[PDB]
Design a protein around this nucleic acid. Structure first.
Lengths: 106, 37, 141, 37, 135, 158, 356, 144, 290, 59
RNA sequence: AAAUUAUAAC
RNA sequence: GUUGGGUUUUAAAAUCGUUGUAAAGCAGAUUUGUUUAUAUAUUUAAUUUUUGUAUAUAGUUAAAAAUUAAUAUUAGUACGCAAGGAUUCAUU
């Protein structure tokens, strides 16, 4: 039982019941915000939201562009995905082969 | 041959491996000037 | 051990050889060779081992500097019908150089033609001897 | 750049130099800024 | 048509003894090999570099040129291959009579009367060779 | 201490490929990367008109094939005529522009090929041939700008 | 791996004076350009300008927003700053679709327009279906999608596995493996997957149980001429002098003696698709695999390759969730010689000769 | 790649898969013919029982067959049964042929020129309306 | 280059594209074994952490000034240039890709301050064709009547950005008179205070424009007052530089020449003509000092 | 490998120069050596003081 | 042209 | 001062202790955390801007010279083929 291997046959079940406690400690706080003043600070957007990040286009110390990719997932879309039917594929999307030989910017 | 400069190990990760060979009256009992990882 | 080379997961160790008949394999390779003769790169053939042996070949063979026009005798006919296997193993005796070779018989740029008039089997026997001599007597011995 | 860059804060063209030392109670007030003095 | 344009180019830069041979349909791989007798190594490089440009605007395909080593410099137009040899080095090799003598490379060339005739070969050397058989 | 390696220099000039059921040469006749790049004194035949024996020319380098890229090998070759005329010497080291080989070398179009005898032509330090005329049929792999612009590109290729 | 690093940029250098666009501070109710002014004025530290109104932050920003409302086209590439892309809709840098389970059917040889000769392997994708989705406790990106294959009688599987397919209602499949999808790539359980899911040029990864060889020696497993050092840190003598050195006293882990030789899970991760037969549900790949015929091979996509995403702007973009057919598209109407979708040339030049 | 990931020289396994490929080093005899004589483990072959040599393997197989033509049963052991039920049908695929060569194809195999007649006498009239698998192979609950 | 036709790109121009799929070269593709878990098709989003994705369940990380949990401690720069709710990972775990659950909330963009709506503003089309130092380059890029000081006659809103040029020259870009007052009676008090004023004269007489440099005057006040400088501009306003204890010539020239750029841009806003500085006898005779 | 493990030819920590002779731990596993000042095989590699820099001359 | 090789290849 | 050439370590090993290698025969499902024999980054040829710089000519990038790999939740003492590669091709 390596040290870094006994630290995880112990803490992994704890790290579970920890973060799942925080998520619970959010619904209580978001529901309390719901009964509290609606339009207020209340530590960001209280209703199960992740404040969109505006600052993700940078120009690093070497004077070249650096983008920060950040994606969120609304639990409704990923839940509509898993029960509704996708759309018919456009005849031009499968009849046009994914061309080899990635063209340069020529 | 002539066994010089013994080393008394205390534990590990708390002795720094330069203090093992310390407790010997020498230029040791100082800080290693250029350590290697 | 620390490596576990074999893996016995139900996904891997399974085999789909029981339901293959639900897929018409040989019915496809026809409809896949048929596409090749519908394209330019093949013409239907029904040889019979005795029939092809010794019969002359025209070739052509594209290639960049110029096409290789070479005339030679067929000697194998690996497939005996129009399947994608093809193969000929001609002898082709171009010049002072002898060059036995294989033709996959589906290639666009490796085109040819066989004729069956002088391809009498009793001519194949001689060509077979002509090569052995050129083969055996070129060993730098 | 050359290393970790720290830009000291700046002001408008006109409000930059010789700012008025006009306070409210222990606070430097100005139409643009506020700062405990 | 294109082979004659190369002659209306080289012959301007004072190339001498220029000879074209429609080597097509014969044993070689190119179809029209030409030959030029320029004097200087530089005089071989110009005619090399000069025909390249003509192979840049009309027949735009001018993939490459080489750097140096222009004692006998060769410039192909793909199948109209131009040789540009020094004044010498032609009283050594063909310049003709290997392609002006080579028969029309026809069929039915299956060990004719002993092929050791080589008027293009016996013109330059002897070259013993033994015809074979199943013997 | 730790005799890490002896000769160590064949491994810089040979194409050594382990035999491990995946890395393996094969007889040719399977696909590109045929096999057996002909690595020893192999006594190639000369073909171009000189006093090279045209029947014997002993090999120098430990690699010869196009799936090994004869297109940049600088393959040295020593001349060992059993007789020349009783013009080269029987003791000089010329490069060689390999033409063909009896070993059945499969091409990248399935076109297997093998000739009656493995042959080649002697050439010079500037990659110019030493002969005037060539008496054999060369292989497609002699089309590189490496051995073209001085090679007569003798006659009918394969 | 050199030339595989993205543009380095730390976190201590993503401040106001580096953002490409106006750096936006958060203030609870709404964003703003100025730092939050602490309410308790006793918190305000010395020489800390609680800016109520800065012109430069407000001028440069004012021209910026007006120019985007008035000249959209020129300021197009600055419309993802304030209008972020929605969820789903196949983000190219983020979405990972699922693959499907194929069966090695046979082999053959194909030729492009050029004289090249490929060694094709026909993979049969019989009856794939998304049988269930799963997530590790609803954690992020830990999504999976299991895809069955080859409907089978109930008298085939053991009970404890057939009972699983009798849960999600899907037809009892022969086998089902799982692919880690992004939550935008989901599809309801039971979506009958077509083979056209793949496009005839993409680089597709496969995984299979290669052919069993039994128990082979070293000359066959790792057969070599000589080696076995990895001496590494252990000391040794060069340049004599102060010399006491240590040697091996155990067969260090990872030796190379005899063993099983190949019933493992092989993985080709760059194979480009060649010919999608969407009538017979066949895919041809121009490679020979060292697997027995009849194996199951899980197909994926090479998400990136050589440095460029597979489904990028230039080359095609996939049928993202999956490939859903039409309403009148009855494959049984057309012969197998019509439901074919070949590929572009994989080689730029005839490979018997050299590059022109 | 173009060469198969395994070359010509590699032994697969017993109970392995087919693993089809192009190869040119097979077919020693008139394979698949009523006397193929091939013996191995990969399915297209007969199970090679323990004999002292390939020749001595035939001699076993011959005298195991010409005891199934006198007494139409036999009690064989081990891998002789599968490679006899297979060979028992070959004799009967060879009985219906009846051509002037079959009896000279079967006189070479059996150690007995009498049984060949009994073989060619009964089996046409007896196995006429049976397609294949003419011999039964019952595994006894005993053991030597 | 070309018509983008991938066929007519090779067959015509021979632009050989790098083999993408079937090459024998590396085909740079890390993460094949080192990255366990879902990998997003973003190429190298995990290559600075050591090509792994294992950890990062942890919120805290060793952070230098400005990085992750350094947002509570005070530091002048990042206290005015970083939203505290924005501090991310540490120094090498920089987030090239972050995926979070939960709905997305976009706090609206900040609107503008002290702009009475329904006041159509005129706009300035800035161009690089302009000399980048012309006064039309420092005027606001949107001119609001709410920002035009009318109490003094000004057509456009005053500039808000000033050039960073450390001025070591003087000139009458829009000045009209630069007097100084000193005291010879002053002997001990402010030895350096006088040492600056006189020095600024000797460094003012060497001003930079074709005017006669005798726009500068030097008065001998017997008032025994600390030396004081008075600069008055064309339109008339006077600027009295602050002569504090410990300020030398090189400091004053930066003082006035800054307040002389604002005075110029105030005058250029008041309709006064522009005397544009240009190459005349002083960009020369200072080019020889090279 | 980030965890590291790229140890040198032996030395761990080397102390200050103190003129021509500089110390060094030479941690490896043992020693043997000699010594210009008193030449006796001296197992004690835990500390070897080299001369100007020649690993040939020690303690 | 010979009986040989080595072969640590079916 | 007499004086100096030598430098190196073994010849049938049931492994018989550790070692590592593979393995315990079907798991619907690689991979929250262990552990990395994993191993090269370049000697070449031929191009593309022989143009930059100098009297001769770079420097970058690509094509060509070879095989890719994931551990542990289900009932067991035949052949994992009833074998002659079809999960019974007709019945006996």
């Amino acid at each position: 039982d390596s040290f870094k291997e006994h630290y995880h046959r112990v803490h992994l079940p704890r790290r579970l019941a920890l973060q799942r406690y925080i998520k619970r400690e959010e619904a209580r706080l978001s529901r309390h915000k719901g009964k509290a003043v609606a339009a207020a600070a209340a530590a960001g957007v209280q209703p199960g939201e992740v404040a969109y990040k505006y600052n993700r286009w940078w120009v690093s110390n070497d004077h070249e562009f650096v983008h920060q990719f950040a994606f969120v997932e609304d639990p409704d879309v990923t839940r509509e995905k898993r029960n509704t039917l996708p759309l018919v594929t456009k005849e031009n999307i499968w009849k046009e082969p994914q061309q080899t030989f990635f063209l340069p910017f020529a | 041959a002539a066994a010089a400069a013994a080393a008394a190990a205390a534990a590990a990760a708390a002795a720094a491996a330069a203090a093992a060979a310390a407790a010997a009256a020498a230029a040791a009992a100082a800080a290693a000037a250029a350590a290697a990882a | 051990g620390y490596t576990r080379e074999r893996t016995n997961r139900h996904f891997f160790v399974s085999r789909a050889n029981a339901f293959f008949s639900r897929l018409p394999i040989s019915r496809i390779q026809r409809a896949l060779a048929m596409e090749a003769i519908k394209k330019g790169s093949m013409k239907p053939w029904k040889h019979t081992k005795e029939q092809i042996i010794g019969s002359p070949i025209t070739c052509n063979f594209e290639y960049n500097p110029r096409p290789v026009r070479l005339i030679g005798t067929v000697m194998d006919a690996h497939t005996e019908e129009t399947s994608i296997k093809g193969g000929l193993k001609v002898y082709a005796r171009s010049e002072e150089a002898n060059m036995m070779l294989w033709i996959p018989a589906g290639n666009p740029k490796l085109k040819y033609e066989v004729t069956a008039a002088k391809g009498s089997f009793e001519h194949y026997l001689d060509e077979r001897s002509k090569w052995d001599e050129a083969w055996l007597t070129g060993r730098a011995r | 750049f050359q290393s970790e860059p720290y830009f000291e804060e700046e002001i408008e063209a006109y409000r930059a130099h010789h700012r008025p030392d006009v306070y409210v109670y222990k606070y430097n007030v100005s139409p643009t800024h506020l700062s405990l003095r | 048509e294109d082979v004659k344009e190369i002659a209306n180019i080289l012959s301007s830069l004072k190339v001498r003894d220029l000879c074209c041979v429609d080597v097509s349909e014969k044993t070689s791989n190119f179809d029209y090999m030409m030959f030029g007798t320029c004097e200087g190594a530089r005089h071989i490089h110009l005619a090399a570099w000069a025909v390249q440009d003509a192979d840049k605007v009309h027949r735009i395909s001018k993939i490459k040129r080489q750097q140096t080593d222009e004692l006998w410099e060769v410039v192909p137009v793909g199948r109209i291959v131009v040789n540009l040899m020094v004044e010498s080095f032609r009283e050594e090799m063909t310049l003709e009579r290997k392609w002006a003598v080579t028969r029309s490379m026809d069929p039915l060339a299956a060990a004719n009367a002993p092929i050791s005739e080589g008027r293009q070969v016996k013109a330059h050397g002897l070259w013993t060779l033994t015809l074979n058989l199943q013997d | 201490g730790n005799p890490v390696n002896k000769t160590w220099f064949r491994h810089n000039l040979i194409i050594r490929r382990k035999g491990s059921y995946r890395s393996r040469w094969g007889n040719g006749t399977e696909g590109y990367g045929a096999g057996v790049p002909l690595s020893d004194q192999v006594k190639l035949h000369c073909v171009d008109n000189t006093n090279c024996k045209h029947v014997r020319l002993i090999a120098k380098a430990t690699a010869e094939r196009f799936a090994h890229c004869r297109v940049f090998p600088a393959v040295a070759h020593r001349v060992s005529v059993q007789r020349f005329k009783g013009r080269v010497k029987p003791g000089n080291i010329y490069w060689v522009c390999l033409f063909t080989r009896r070993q059945t070398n499969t091409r990248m179009s399935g076109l297997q090929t093998n000739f009656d005898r493995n042959t080649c032509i002697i050439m010079n330090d500037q990659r110019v041939p030493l002969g005037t005329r060539v008496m054999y049929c060369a292989g497609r792999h002699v089309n590189h700008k490496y051995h073209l612009k001085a090679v007569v590109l003798a006659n009918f290729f394969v | 791996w050199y030339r595989c690093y993205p543009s380095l940029m730390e976190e201590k250098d993503r401040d106001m004076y580096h953002c490409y666009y106006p750096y936006l501070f958060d203030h609870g109710d709404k964003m703003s350009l100025y730092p939050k002014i602490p309410d308790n004025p006793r918190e305000w530290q010395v020489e800390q300008l609680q800016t109520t109104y800065d012109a430069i932050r407000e001028d440069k920003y004012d021209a910026f927003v007006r120019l985007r409302a008035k000249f959209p086209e020129l300021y197009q590439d600055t419309y993802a700053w304030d209008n972020p892309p929605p969820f789903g809709e196949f983000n190219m840098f983020y979405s990972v679709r699922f693959g499907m389970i194929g069966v090695k059917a046979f082999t053959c040889k194909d030729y492009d327009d050029l004289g090249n000769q490929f060694d094709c392997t026909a993979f049969w994708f019989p009856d794939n279906q998304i049988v269930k989705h799963s997530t590790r406790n609803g954690d992020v990106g830990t999504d999976k999608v299991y895809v069955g294959a080859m409907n089978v009688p109930v008298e085939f599987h053991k009970p404890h596995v057939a009972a699983f397919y009798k849960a999600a209602g899907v037809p009892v499949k022969h086998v089902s493996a799982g692919f880690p999808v992004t939550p935008d790539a989901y599809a309801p359980v039971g979506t009958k997957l077509d083979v056209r899911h793949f496009k005839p040029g993409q680089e597709v990864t496969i995984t299979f149980q290669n052919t069993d060889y039994g128990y082979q020696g070293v000359m066959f497993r790792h057969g070599f001429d000589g080696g076995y050092v990895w001496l590494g840190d252990s000391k040794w003598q060069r340049r004599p002098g102060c010399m006491g050195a240590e040697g091996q006293k155990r067969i260090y882990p990872g030796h190379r003696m005899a063993g099983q030789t190949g019933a493992s899970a092989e993985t080709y991760d760059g194979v480009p698709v060649w010919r999608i037969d969407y009538k017979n549900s066949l895919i041809y790949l121009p490679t020979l695999i060292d697997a027995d015929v009849g194996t199951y091979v899980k197909f994926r996509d090479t998400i990136n390759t050589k440095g460029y995403t597979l489904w990028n702007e230039h080359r095609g973009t996939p049928p993202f969730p999956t490939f859903i057919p039409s309403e009148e598209e009855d494959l049984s109407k057309l012969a197998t010689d019509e439901g074919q979708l070949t590929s572009p040339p994989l080689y730029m030049y005839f490979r018997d000769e050299f590059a022109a | 790649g173009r060469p198969p990931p395994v070359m010509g020289h590699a032994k697969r396994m017993r109970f392995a898969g087919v693993d089809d490929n192009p190869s040119v080093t097979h077919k020693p005899w008139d394979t698949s013919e009523p006397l193929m004589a091939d013996y191995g483990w990969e399915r297209g072959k007969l199970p090679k029982f323990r004999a002292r040599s390939p020749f001595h393997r035939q001699q076993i197989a011959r005298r195991m067959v010409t005891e199934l033509i006198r007494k139409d049963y036999v009690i064989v052991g081990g891998a002789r049964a599968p490679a006899l039920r297979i060979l028992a049908d070959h004799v009967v695929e060879l009985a219906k042929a009846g051509d002037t060569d079959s009896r000279q194809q079967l006189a070479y195999f059996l150690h007995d020129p009498l049984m060949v007649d009994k073989a060619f006498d009964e089996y046409p009239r007896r196995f006429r309306d049976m397609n294949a698998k003419y011999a039964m192979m019952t595994r006894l609950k005993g053991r030597r | 280059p070309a018509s983008h036709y991938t066929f007519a790109n090779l067959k015509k121009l021979g632009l050989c594209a790098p083999q993408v799929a079937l090459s024998r070269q590396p085909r740079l593709r890390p993460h094949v074994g080192h990255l366990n878990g879902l990998v997003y098709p973003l190429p190298y989003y995990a290559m600075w952490r050591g090509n792994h994705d294992k950890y990062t369940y942890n919120q805290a990380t060793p952070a230098r000034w400005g990085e992750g949990n350094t947002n509570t401690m005070y530091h002048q720069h990042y206290a005015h240039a970083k939203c505290p709710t924005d501090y991310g990972r540490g120094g090498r775990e920089f987030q090239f890709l972050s995926v979070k659950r939960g709905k997305l909330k976009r706090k609206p963009l900040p609107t503008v301050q002290y702009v009475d709506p329904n006041s159509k503003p005129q706009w300035v089309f800035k161009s690089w064709h302009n000399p980048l130092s012309a006064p039309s380059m420092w005027e606001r890029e949107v001119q609001y009547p709410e920002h035009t000081p009318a109490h003094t006659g000004a057509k456009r809103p005053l500039a808000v950005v000033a050039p960073k040029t450390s001025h070591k020259h003087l000139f009458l870009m829009h000045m009209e008179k630069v007097t100084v007052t000193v005291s010879p009676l002053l002997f001990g008090y402010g030895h350096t205070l006088q040492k600056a004023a006189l020095d600024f004269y000797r460094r003012g007489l060497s001003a930079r424009s074709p005017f006669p440099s005798d726009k500068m005057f030097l008065y001998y006040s017997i008032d025994h007052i600390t030396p004081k400088i008075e600069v008055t501009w064309l339109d008339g306003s006077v600027y009295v530089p602050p002569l504090i204890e410990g300020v030398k010539a090189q400091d004053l020239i930066q003082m006035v020449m800054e307040q002389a750029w604002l005075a110029a841009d105030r005058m250029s806003a008041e309709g006064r003509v522009l005397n544009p500085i240009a190459i005349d006898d002083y960009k020369w005779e200072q080019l020889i000092a090279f | 490998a980030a965890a590291a493990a790229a140890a040198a030819a032996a030395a761990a920590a080397a102390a200050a120069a103190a003129a021509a002779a500089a110390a060094a731990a030479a941690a490896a596993a043992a020693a043997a050596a000699a010594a210009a000042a008193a030449a006796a095989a001296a197992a004690a590699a835990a500390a070897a003081a080299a001369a100007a820099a020649a690993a040939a001359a020690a303690a």
